[PDB]
Amino acid sequence: SSQTLDRDPTLTLSLIAKNTPANSMIMTKLPSVRVKTEGYNPSINVNELFAYVDLSGSEPGEHDYEVKVEPIPNIKIVEISPRVVTLQLEHHHHHH
Numbered sequence: 001s002s003q004t005l006d007r008d009p010t011l012t013l014s015l016i017a018k019n020t021p022a023n024s025m026i027m028t029k030l031p032s033v034r035v036k037t038e039g040y041n042p043s044i045n046v047n048e049l050f051a052y053v054d055l056s057g058s059e060p061g062e063h064d065y066e067v068k069v070e071p072i073p074n075i076k077i078v079e080i081s082p083r084v085v086t087l088q089l090e091h092h093h094h095h096h
Helices: none
Strands: 010-013 015-017 024-026 033-037 051-053 062-066 077-081 084-091
Touching: none
Parallel strands: 015 051
Antiparallel strands: 010 033, 024 084, 033 077, 062 084
């Protein structure tokens, strides 16, 4: 006997790598992520929802990158799961 007010939505975002260094090739697959929001968006063009990690650095090492979500100018975020991931970086093109 109520209009809105329903459990938080659980949508999965395609984890894509951004700021990918040049001549660099990652050695690990990128899996989606499960996020929770303390709100209710039956629509809001869910198409425009993605998660991206920062790669402001490059070096053949196993660096742990934090999951950075896209701020929503209307609703609030609750948390992420996982919250951090390990991606192996490897060089490419054996010189000239």
